Amino acid sequence: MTTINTHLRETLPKIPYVKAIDMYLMGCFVFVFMALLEYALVNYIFFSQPAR
Amino acid sequence: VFGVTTVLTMTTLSISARNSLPKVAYATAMDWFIAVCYAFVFSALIEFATV
């Protein structure tokens, strides 16, 4: 995702506000982040309640 | 690791190929070839899941 972001970044100028493409990429970054945190949560409590 | 590295390098190659020519709405033959190969990688992963 970082690779996609940098390749997009080079083409455009430096504008302060947030674009639509930026909103989409931020959403996707949040999705990936939450997936990783969900895995961390699963690994954290597994010893006590593996069924959970 | 096979899956992740194949998909990552395939995405990098797909990005690289497009910069060789100007922005065009239509899809070039190169794009079709890359898409079909990406589909083959995806199909390999799907067959993995099935097995």
From Swiss-Prot, chain A:
Subunit field text: Heteropentamer, formed by a combination of alpha (GABRA1-6), beta (GABRB1-3), gamma (GABRG1-3), delta (GABRD), epsilon (GABRE), rho (GABRR1-3), pi (GABRP) and theta (GABRQ) chains, each subunit exhibiting distinct physiological and pharmacological properties. Interacts with UBQLN1. May interact with KIF21B. Identified in a complex of 720 kDa composed of LHFPL4, NLGN2, GABRA1, GABRB2, GABRG2 and GABRB3.
Shown chain mapped onto the complete sequence: 285 to 331 of 512
Top-rank lineage group of the source organism: Eukaryota
Pathological condition linked to this protein in its record: Epileptic encephalopathy, infantile or early childhood, 2: A form of epileptic encephalopathy, a heterogeneous group of severe childhood onset epilepsies characterized by refractory seizures, neurodevelopmental impairment, and poor prognosis. Development is normal prior to seizure onset, after which cognitive and motor delays become apparent. IECEE2 is an autosomal dominant condition with variable age at seizure onset, ranging from early infancy to 6 years.
Tissue: Isoform 1 and isoform 2 show reduced expression in schizophrenic brain. Isoform 3 shows increased expression in schizophrenic and bipolar disorder brains while isoform 4 shows reduced expression.
Free-text function comment from the UniProt entry: Beta subunit of the heteropentameric ligand-gated chloride channel gated by gamma-aminobutyric acid (GABA), a major inhibitory neurotransmitter in the brain. GABA-gated chloride channels, also named GABA(A) receptors (GABAAR), consist of five subunits arranged around a central pore and contain GABA active binding site(s) located at the alpha and beta subunit interface(s). When activated by GABA, GABAARs selectively allow the flow of chloride anions across the cell membrane down their electrochemical gradient.
Similarity comment: family membership: Belongs to the ligand-gated ion channel (TC 1.A.9) family. Gamma-aminobutyric acid receptor (TC 1.A.9.5) subfamily. GABRB2 sub-subfamily.
Protein name, UniProt field: Gamma-aminobutyric acid receptor subunit beta-2
Record field: transmembrane: 27-47
Compartment annotation: Postsynaptic cell membrane; Cell membrane; Cytoplasmic vesicle membrane
Impact reported for residue 9 to P: In IECEE2; uncertain significance
Domain commentary: The extracellular domain contributes to synaptic contact formation. GABAARs subunits share a common topological structure: a peptide sequence made up of a long extracellular N-terminal, four transmembrane domains, intracellular or cytoplasmic domain located between the third and the fourth transmembrane domains.
Extracellular side: 9-26
From Swiss-Prot, chain B:
Membrane-spanning ranges: 1-18, 29-50
Subcellular compartments: Postsynaptic cell membrane; Cell membrane; Cytoplasmic vesicle membrane
Record topology, Extracellular segments: 19-28
Miscellaneous comment text of the record: Functions as a receptor for diazepines and various anesthetics, such as pentobarbital; these are bound at a separate allosteric effector binding site.
Reported disease: Epilepsy, childhood absence 4: A subtype of idiopathic generalized epilepsy characterized by an onset at age 6-7 years, frequent absence seizures (several per day) and bilateral, synchronous, symmetric 3-Hz spike waves on EEG. Tonic-clonic seizures often develop in adolescence. Absence seizures may either remit or persist into adulthood. Epilepsy, idiopathic generalized 13: A disorder characterized by recurring generalized seizures in the absence of detectable brain lesions and/or metabolic abnormalities. Generalized seizures arise diffusely and simultaneously from both hemispheres of the brain. Seizure types include juvenile myoclonic seizures, absence seizures, and generalized tonic-clonic seizures.
Biological role stated in the UniProt entry: Alpha subunit of the heteropentameric ligand-gated chloride channel gated by Gamma-aminobutyric acid (GABA), a major inhibitory neurotransmitter in the brain. GABA-gated chloride channels, also named GABA(A) receptors (GABAAR), consist of five subunits arranged around a central pore and contain GABA active binding site(s) located at the alpha and beta subunit interface(s). When activated by GABA, GABAARs selectively allow the flow of chloride anions across the cell membrane down their electrochemical gradient. Alpha-1/GABRA1-containing GABAARs are largely synaptic.
Subunit and interaction comment: Heteropentamer, formed by a combination of alpha (GABRA1-6), beta (GABRB1-3), gamma (GABRG1-3), delta (GABRD), epsilon (GABRE), rho (GABRR1-3), pi (GABRP) and theta (GABRQ) subunits, each subunit exhibiting distinct physiological and pharmacological properties. Interacts with UBQLN1. Interacts with TRAK1. Interacts with KIF21B. Identified in a complex of 720 kDa composed of LHFPL4, NLGN2, GABRA1, GABRB2, GABRG2 and GABRB3. Interacts with LHFPL4. Interacts with NLGN2. Interacts with SHISA7; interaction leads regulation of GABAAR trafficking, channel deactivation kinetics and pharmacology.
Domain comment quoted from the record: The extracellular domain contributes to synaptic contact formation.
UniProt similarity note: Belongs to the ligand-gated ion channel (TC 1.A.9) family. Gamma-aminobutyric acid receptor (TC 1.A.9.5) subfamily. GABRA1 sub-subfamily.
Protein name: Gamma-aminobutyric acid receptor subunit alpha-1
Record organism: Homo sapiens
Source lineage: Eukaryota, Metazoa, Chordata, Craniata, Vertebrata
Gene: GABRA1
Residue span relative to the full protein: 284 to 334 of 456
